[PDB]
RNA sequence: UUUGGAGAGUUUGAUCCUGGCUCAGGACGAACGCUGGCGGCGUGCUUAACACAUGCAAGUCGAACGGAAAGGCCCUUUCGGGGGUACUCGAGUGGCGAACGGGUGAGUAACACGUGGGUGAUCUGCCCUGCACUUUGGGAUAAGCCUGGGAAACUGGGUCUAAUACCGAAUACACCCUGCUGGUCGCAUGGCCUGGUAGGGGAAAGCUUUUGCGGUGUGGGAUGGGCCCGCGGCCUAUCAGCUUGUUGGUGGGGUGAUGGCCUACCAAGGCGACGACGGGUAGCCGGCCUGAGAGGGUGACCGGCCACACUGGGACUGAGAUACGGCCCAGACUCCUACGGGAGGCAGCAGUGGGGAAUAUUGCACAAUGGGCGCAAGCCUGAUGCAGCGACGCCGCGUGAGGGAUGACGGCCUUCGGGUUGUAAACCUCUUUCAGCACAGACGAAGCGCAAGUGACGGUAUGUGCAGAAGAAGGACCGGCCAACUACGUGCCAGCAGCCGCGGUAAUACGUAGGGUCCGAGCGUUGUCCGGAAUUACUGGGCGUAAAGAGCUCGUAGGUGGUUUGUCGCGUUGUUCGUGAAAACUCA
């Protein structure tokens, strides 16, 4: 069960923007409705309640879902939050998108759930599949000649494809190597407030 | 009276089966001596594994298999091997190995570059 | 024991069918279980339309 | 009594079980004959009359109607009676 | 040498202490209201151990026997049927199976269960492996035929027949007893050395001509069991003494086994404040939940034991019996009944009546495994394997996207400037996952048979084509705890509420509208169990005024103990070995 509604509204409501793009949200920085002036009171709780909410609505992810990614998070036995941000990138959505390959997550969402990549020579429609060190991901041919995946692969201008992430070639296969380290991912908000509030 | 049972373990699309040694009277599932071996059917190779000391020891000291064990024992060699007629011969068939990730990866980025 | 009513009207009446539940009130002093709303010979109440779930009305068309 | 194998097992179990009362009064009179010829304290009508017992006891063991260790604990009893009296 | 502890609200004009109450998380064998697309996976009488229609849930051997009622073949035919064949087999004798398998938890405070041993005091078909063998004679009967009661089941009388069915005798000195006679051990009697010696006794069935099975006694394996022991595991003095085979010993009986186990004769004792005898509850364990930990609750499914088959007694069988579809007797219930007499135990698989909140279809197969019978072919299997119903719980996928305006209708506010739903929408394109329509079509079966075949699942799963954004979203909350506000309608009325507490004309707390937050094929309410609860405090606490030093003495059981010498290894501590099933949790 995907989003329908707005996506400008989430950004509105929150105060800072998320696709980046958002013209609105600039040009009305306020949070909206008919009492976004109002001052609101301050309070740990809120704090720890727009930074889990940005996070969830921008990356799309379901409630469940960044659940028990952060349970398996803490159960790792690294760092909590590194666990967390590194599987949480791991989404093959998020792969695609930060590859270049997609200009939203929506669409690259709708475009995974569809399947129009190839992993490892066998078809996999998961919008949600999990992605390991040390994969192959592969295009079809039904997705060469599409003419959107066509627009992207000849604009891909957008930001640098990160470390662990990098293109081969005009088939935009996209591997990964070594495991993200927060620092290099330098991922927007923090992940420290996320995890004890969950912890609460 | 002891007979060597499969036990019905695993899944209900792909089943999978034990090679256990128990009396006659016991459960399909439940009290068992020792596990000496196992059967895949859902990998076409067919995987089959199997104690073969053991199971001399037991057909020595006078196990009854069913038929599929006795099967089984012909597959491996080991019924064979005990009746010493033909002698020891291995008509197991073992799985295809799976070309190394590692090399699939080196052949992929050389055909990139 | 004693049964609440629930809702802003009722059609109960002597020898009726009543589904129970627990609840506690702090105006009156003794009530503690409140009659299920809209079931067996109870209906739902009338003009309702948000809060819906809870006294059992249906949905509007 | 339900169906023609319980009842054909049931007619089986009763006829031999009048064979199998049938013998074990007679074990059961060899067993009483001894007693009341140690009670009277006959030497060797006694003799023979064990002798006929752990025969028939023997073959009682033999046939199955008791225990091969019942009958030989029986005999041992039987000597053990007769040398103390 | 490694793993891990959070608070908030609430008494007062204001402060602190103790202490009560409520909330934020997880779980269910769940129920209810609303809503409700698909795929995969587990699970489905916790109450009335209430009463049950119905159909099934245990049979197999002609290579044991007498035989041919029904089939086949060959002789014959009038198509009524007359002979043999054993291919085949009705019913009847004769072996084996039938204590296996499957359900339930009323009874138990007990060796019943786990744990670790003992059994010099034990038994054991079917299997394997050794030793010596496996002579002879005889009576009887089912069956078949005749016949009586009677609708009935079943039953009396006469005639008659075979077997591996039954019964004498042929030996047996590896077997069991009694009298005399040596070596080791200790666990005490006494065991073992198959110690030695004198006497006594101990049984068999054949068929088949084929991958052969049977009959007697003895040695060893492996399973199967039987008896006993130290430790462990609820509450309760508003239960203080209990017992006469009860305690200990001698002669007999007895079982397989040692044994007041029973009987006869002797002595009067044993257990008791380190809780007997009483009263209440309850099957136990590997586990599950919670919890860092100690600790607490619980016995779903699965796995191992204990006990039960309407209630209460008794006995035979067998190597094996609480003998759930074995037997005899006593009580309640039901049914047929020609009124002479008979028939019954779903807590086995389905199903019916009642209980309540609730728990299913009177479904398909031996295709794989297990079990039972037979030399095999072969036969049975409601065990087992599968399907149907239930959003009961777990996981997954679908109801679209790229660009699109300082942002087109309509709605609510408005300080009347104007803002909202809104990248939403109409729009140009896209591939269209699963449904929908066709084709192919599995593995599960190195399996069974000496036949020529063998898949219930299923023609499902799964691949190959066709059409079209075409078919698919709702429920709670928005005063603070506790992420989320405006307008309108009645105002101590009607109403909300887990706590604080909210309406007495201008309610962000009542009702209705827009807007927002949360969740999502689930959303809310109820119940139960743990946590925070250091709020039973061993690890973690107090007793002057907040709950708490009995009004003071004497004194039994126990606890506890000043300084030193020797000795014991009970407490304590080190090393090594056996065991701690499977399943369960963690790592890969
Ligand atoms: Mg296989
Ligand atoms: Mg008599
Ligand atoms: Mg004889
Ligand atoms: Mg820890
Ligand atoms: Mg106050
Ligand atoms: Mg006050
Ligand atoms: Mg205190
Ligand atoms: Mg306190
Ligand atoms: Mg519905
Ligand atoms: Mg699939
Ligand atoms: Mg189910
Ligand atoms: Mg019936
Ligand atoms: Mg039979
Ligand atoms: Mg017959
Ligand atoms: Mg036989
Ligand atoms: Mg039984
Ligand atoms: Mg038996
Ligand atoms: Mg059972
Ligand atoms: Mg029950
Ligand atoms: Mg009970
Ligand atoms: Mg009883
Ligand atoms: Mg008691
Ligand atoms: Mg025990
Ligand atoms: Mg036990
Ligand atoms: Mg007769
Ligand atoms: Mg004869
Ligand atoms: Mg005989
Ligand atoms: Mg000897
Ligand atoms: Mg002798
Ligand atoms: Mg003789
Ligand atoms: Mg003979
Ligand atoms: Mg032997
Ligand atoms: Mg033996
Ligand atoms: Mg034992
Ligand atoms: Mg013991
Ligand atoms: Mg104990
Ligand atoms: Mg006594
Ligand atoms: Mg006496
Ligand atoms: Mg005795
Ligand atoms: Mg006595
Ligand atoms: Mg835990
Ligand atoms: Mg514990
Ligand atoms: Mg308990
Ligand atoms: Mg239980
Ligand atoms: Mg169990
Ligand atoms: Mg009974
Ligand atoms: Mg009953
Ligand atoms: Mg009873
Ligand atoms: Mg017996
Ligand atoms: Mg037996
Ligand atoms: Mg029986
Ligand atoms: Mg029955
Ligand atoms: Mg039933
Ligand atoms: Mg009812
Ligand atoms: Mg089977
Ligand atoms: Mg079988
Ligand atoms: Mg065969
Ligand atoms: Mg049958
Ligand atoms: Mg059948
Ligand atoms: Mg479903
Ligand atoms: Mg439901
Ligand atoms: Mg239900
Ligand atoms: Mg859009
Ligand atoms: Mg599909
Ligand atoms: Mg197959
Ligand atoms: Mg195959
Ligand atoms: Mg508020
Ligand atoms: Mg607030
Ligand atoms: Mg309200
Ligand atoms: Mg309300
Ligand atoms: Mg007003
Ligand atoms: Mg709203
Ligand atoms: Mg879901
Ligand atoms: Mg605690
Ligand atoms: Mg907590
Ligand atoms: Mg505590
Ligand atoms: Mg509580
Ligand atoms: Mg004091
Ligand atoms: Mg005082
Ligand atoms: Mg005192
Ligand atoms: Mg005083
Ligand atoms: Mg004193
Ligand atoms: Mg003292
Ligand atoms: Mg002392
Ligand atoms: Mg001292
Ligand atoms: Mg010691
Ligand atoms: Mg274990
Ligand atoms: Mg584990």
New binding site residues.
Partial sequence: ??????????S??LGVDLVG?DQ?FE??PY?????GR?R?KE?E??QQ??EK?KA??SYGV????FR?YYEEAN?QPGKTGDNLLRILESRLDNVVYRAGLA??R??A???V????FLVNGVKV?????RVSQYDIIDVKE?SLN???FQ?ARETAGERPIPSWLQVVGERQRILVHQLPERAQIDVPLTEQLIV??Y?? | ??????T?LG?????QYRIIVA???????????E?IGRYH??E?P?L?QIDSERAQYWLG??A??????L?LL??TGDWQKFKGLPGAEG???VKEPKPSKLDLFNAALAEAE | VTAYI?????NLQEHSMV?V????????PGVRYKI?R??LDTQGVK??????????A???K | ?????????????????L???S??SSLRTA?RGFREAVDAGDKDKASELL?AT??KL??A??????????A?????????????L
């Fill in positions: 069960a995907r989003y329908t509604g707005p996506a400008t509204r989430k509105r409501r793009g609105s040009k009305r949070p909206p409705g008919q009492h109002a609101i309070s709780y809120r309640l727009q909410q969830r609505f379901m409630e469940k879902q028990r159960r200009r939203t929506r669409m969402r709708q475009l759930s569809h399947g129009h429609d998961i919008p949600s599949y039904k599409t003419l959107p627009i004890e509030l912890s609460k | 009276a002891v007979k060597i049972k499969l019905r899944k209900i699309r792909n089943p009396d006659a009277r016991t459960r399909r599932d439940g009290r068992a001596i596990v059917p859902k076409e067919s089959i000291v006078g009854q298999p069913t038929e599929p064990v099967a012909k597959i008509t197991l068939k | 629930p809702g802003e009207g009722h589904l539940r627990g609840g506690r009130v702090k105006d009156l299920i809209g079931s003009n309702r339309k948000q809060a819906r779930s809870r006294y059992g249906k949905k509007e | 009594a339900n169906i023609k194998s319980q009842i054909k097992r049931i007619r089986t179990n009763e006829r031999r079980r064979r199998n009362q013998v074990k067993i002798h752990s025969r023997d073959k063991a033999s046939k199955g109607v008791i225990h091969p260790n019942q030989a604990n029986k005999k041992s009893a039987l000597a053990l009676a007769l040398n103390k």
